[model samples]
Target: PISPIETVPVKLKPGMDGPKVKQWPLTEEKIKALVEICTEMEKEGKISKIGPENPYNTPVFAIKKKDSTKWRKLVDFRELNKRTQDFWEVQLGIPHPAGLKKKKSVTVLDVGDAYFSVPLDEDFRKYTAFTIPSINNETPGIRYQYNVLPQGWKGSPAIFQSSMTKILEPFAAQNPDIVIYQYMDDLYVGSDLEIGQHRTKIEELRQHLLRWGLTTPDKKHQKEPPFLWMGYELHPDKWTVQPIVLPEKDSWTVNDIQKLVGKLNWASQIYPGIKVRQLSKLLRGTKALTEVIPLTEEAELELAENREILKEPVHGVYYDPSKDLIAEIQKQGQGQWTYQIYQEPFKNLKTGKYARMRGAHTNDVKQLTEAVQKITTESIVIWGKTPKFKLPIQKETWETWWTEYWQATWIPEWEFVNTPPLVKLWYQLEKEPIVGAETFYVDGAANRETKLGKAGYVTNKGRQKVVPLTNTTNQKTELQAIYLALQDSGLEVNIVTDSQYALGIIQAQPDKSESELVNQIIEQLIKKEKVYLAWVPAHKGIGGNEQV
Candidate 1:
């Protein structure tokens, strides 16, 4: 079947201005490699020479491959990516090689320049332009756009994975017995029971991939596996899985940085993958995922069970370790432990409020390393977690936490804090400022387990809200309520709150942490197209004061 994977055009985020970035210095070899890559793209019709009508330009950078001397040229879409729409429909991890056995036959497939295999739309190509730094005088540099999709674009992996998924679904239906693990462009397949027929199934996989237009650089399931970077490997003879490169120090790699940007793509108003990828660059290095020790039967069981404790984990929720996710190590701290498939959620009986820890959100995660002993020797394992994943309420307030709580999204732009004094008073209160907007009625409270619960708006549309959150200090319940209301209400609407704490932070003020929350709200406030927060004395024989 004839095939060339098609490029599916992606939409750019709304309200985006291209970001400018400076290029890194290049060496002779690097320059040569970069030039060759550009030439090859032209030859392959993956890029083109364009006239200057398109002013959009992104910088190009060289990333050294850890296992080889060659470098991959990537367009730094750093700024553009921040605003790109990331609608990842599915979230699945790279496949694990659990079923393969030495008795099986095998075949490994590597898609040729995996990302390049997916073409990018010519219309959207202007955003992908890269600058080729000049080598010397009289040598004018070139600015060209990629005709094919660039690897570093925020949505690349999800797009590729979704493509591969379509290709494999039918193949699986036809050959249910064939065990295949597709990692982006790489495919790992084996059938311990197939014996002489394994090659037949492997060749069939090749046909299906081509039928679906996925080009494979391909081949060789035995001996050297290209590099330690792209594919999966496991030894047959040893009882242990030997992956070789695990270390505890902070190491950075080009792939790590690229992936980090990719992880930031993984979050809200952003993607989770990009955020994790970004953190990976800073904390875990490219080898982070590969940094693992062989799992003992006991340890593996423990990991499997605990991994499921919180069935559907979401970022920013707290999990209790005592009964839910039982990850305690053996006495004297051996490598073995026990876990659960899904931890029971701690729920408030009266209010029915609950908190779950999906671990951490992409932005808040940090890398962590641990050294553990098996018998005599020790191995290191590195992982990530979000330590700041806090509840709207904390310990001791457990009763109120489940009773009243809330979490929140909105995007930002040109941060100017010039509110007209006649229009709003709080805008001028910078350096521990009071912030507000156009005349609007607003009142906030954290007065009870469930007492202080309202932020309302009375406009031409008659806006009103009751934020049922508790255990949080009176200051923030009021703050978050105000934040959401302003967000929900379009800009230019001013706020009227009963608490002067709303005017700004004052220390020894119940909770110093509340000061930080105020500043967070303030940071977002100043950047808004227009939002004003004003303070008024509470309950001085006022009829609407009852709303506070």
Candidate 2:
């Protein structure tokens, strides 16, 4: 019989343009393999010859299968997939790992060539066309498209799952006791019925699928506990590590590291102790998949530690609705925070009463709530009960803290605000201001373009005055101005300037000082009873500062 679901034509998004037909340069061996695949597809009526004028085209390449010397033809349908409408609208109620633990027995079925079993309407077949090179000089190159749902197309799995669900609706109605979990090609028949009845129900499902143009390999039907599903070896109320078959190599490419990280992450579902931090160095060094990168000594050690941890026994807890799930968040070193979700497993199951089910670190505070929601949702999905989160009450407040480390010595404290503002006075500019032994605001100016230097000073009750000078910098003129103000009047006077350099001249024992000007200023200071030298910001709106 034909497929159970009537063929629905592939829906293209409105006004979407088709990509230009492109061919990848393949080796002679790959070309031969592709031609063989095309021939087999043609003989089985899976693909049909298309005219060269077909509007839609996609490239095809051969990728070697993992752990096998054989190659598989992969059509790059990314561009076409982008322009296609979604095939499945509703979310499928696929069996969660924790949900299956509640069942007495489960049987998993794998449908061989799941996507190919579904037929595509003739009108929509043109969009899946690919150009294949000539087999030999004797044969001409031909363009062909799929007659059935093709692999690598984004909508293939969803379309297949939707149709598969419809195909098994009759069986589901008849056998209400048997719970069928269909995720793409994976069909898990879970039931709490007697073993004999479960077996009979599974066999009935096989026959029902067979009638709908679907076939499962004899070895693919798993009827026992600890069966493999979703990349994990799952048993009743427990999850065991699935030995991931990775390619053996001393050094790894970026792609290989990516695969390793993915597998470890999957396995981490059962082992919460696995440190993702171990892969940080490796992740930082690699960006491109094709680039070969040798692991550092430290990375090699970390990888070894990861592998060692995998060998250790992993204890995972099943979702129990009666127990309380504690979600605790702790702020890590610096601004990072780590959150952990733990649940008290059933009594007498293991020594560890509480099981750490999930945990992750995030630098963002907003994501903490997101992580909690994710864990809660997962638990709710499995048991149909919301978990009570015992999350700590986190409060953020501005507080004072000091570091004893030398690096923090340069950090400023709030006490700096207590200091008073500096003031300046305009003096010599006033015409006979009747000012003596008074505070003066002295400043020096220099323009590199004009190569001019000038010194000025002002008393508290005087206008601005300047002494222009040549062949000197601002620093030299600043000292000269101070000397000019002090040298004339041998009085205990206070001098202020905007330049810290001029203040440094009289204050500190001069290292690289203009000895003549600095000695004169020091002599003036010594000659007077006591003179004060200070530095002030010129435009601080201090009454006398802006004048100078």
User: Judged by lDDT, which candidate is best?
Assistant: 2
Q: Give the alpha-carbon lDDT of every model.
A: 0.46, 0.62
Q: Write the residue-wise lDDT of candidate 1 on 84-134 in tens digits.
A: 676575445432222123334555677776666666655666777666766
Candidate 1 structure lDDT: 0.46
- For each predicted model, how many residue pairs clash, with residues at least 3 apart or on different chains? 36, 5
Instruction: Flag regions of model 1 displaced more than 4 Å.
Output: 1-6, 19-33, 62-72, 89-106, 133-141, 210-219, 223-548
lDDT tens per residue, model 2, 95-206: 5554344577877788887888888766777788888775356655678888888888877777787789888898999989888866667787788899898888888888
Which residue pairs show backbone clashes in model 2? 425-458, 426-458, 426-459, 427-458, 427-459
